[PDB]
Design a protein around this ligand. Sequence first.
Ligand SMILES: [Cl-]
Length: 485
Amino acid sequence: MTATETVRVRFCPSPTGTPHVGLVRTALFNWAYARHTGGTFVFRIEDTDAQRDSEESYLALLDALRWLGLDWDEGPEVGGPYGPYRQSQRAEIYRDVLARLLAAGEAYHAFSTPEEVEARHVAAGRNPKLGYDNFDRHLTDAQRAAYLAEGRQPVVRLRMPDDDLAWNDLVRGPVTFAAGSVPDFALTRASGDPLYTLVNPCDDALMKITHVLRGEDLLPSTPRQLALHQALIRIGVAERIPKFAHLPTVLGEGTKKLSKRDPQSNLFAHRDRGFIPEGLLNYLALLGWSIADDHDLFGLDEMVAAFDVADVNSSPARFDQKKADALNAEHIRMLDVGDFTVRLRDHLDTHGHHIALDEAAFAAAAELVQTRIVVLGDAWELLKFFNDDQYVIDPKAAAKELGPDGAAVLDAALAALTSVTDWTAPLIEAALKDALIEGLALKPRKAFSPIRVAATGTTVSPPLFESLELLGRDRSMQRLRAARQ
Ligand SMILES: [Cl-]
């Protein structure tokens, strides 16, 4: 349908707070569409507010993308032809643009106070809650000269065109704002500082962005942006207006956007719990898109191959922790055991949940639990019984399994285990089955539950015999002996 589009897309977050999963969804959609089409992914930091902005947040945005495996073609660290890529560094570019806009009559200096606007609404019998009145379009040279001579500091406003402001949204379809409905808008504050309304569309133009893919909560900015892009083409600064694609807002439990105050929106809360990049990328891909109607499990290469903005839906995109957890668990199970073992060791070690097993033993234990967890952190509760200072016999398990009958099972197993020549899972198994099954004719649940509770503290544990092997003879014997009291 048919030539591949020529694509330059951006991810343009503000460095305020922690990396919001809606915003990371938007990064991924941009990245996937670039990679699908052989296009360029531009990373721009929109840091024009010193009050809210922080270097901690900047570094965390870089870390978020790198951890997720989403590399950028132009942006911080890497550079590129249209830099610098932090807006805090492009002050001189914005001043030039403003100057050019002002000299073409695309933009003008405006001196009204909000109170003078309100008073003009009242005299004309207009709703005084309405906005800017375009009064300053029509200032005489003398009146303009006269405001400056009084020390008025103007703002720069853009002169809106007279026609409709409309585009065909790649996700939302046709959108139109009527001729005259949008007041001439401020591109600066009275200090001269440029506002989002200048810097965002200006850098999209200057960085030659072809497709703007962003959350649909920003849709209302688009007409103002269209106006500015048009002005920038007239003054020879840009060439083409980008296409726009507005992505479904990521919701929490109701109709409301998932909040930045809500810990579920924090990418790194998921990290800390033990999401892996492959899990979380798969999940975030499902927040407005879908590889197939018959399955939702996929990797990044599969997404790159399949992803087109034409297939983004505008249906409600609700964040569902259960689904995210389920996909993470599938992705965990897809890892090669060596990869998984290294990731799991590092996760536990770096969250002060060291497991008291040597490297090869821990690998063996990791192998045993790869199919039992939804997130890496869950392995602590499953494996901490290897740590003598964490082991505790659950009192309900004890009451049920460590009665006189179970006590009797331990007596037999303990004598069984002394005959085990080498302390390995098969010989442990054989000794205990010889004694408890072949010998005492016990039902397996009856033969083994007391030994599992004794050795692990609980009625559910990793494979019992393997677990006994890794605990070692001395520890296993000690626990079994104590369990009978
Ligand atoms: Cl969102």
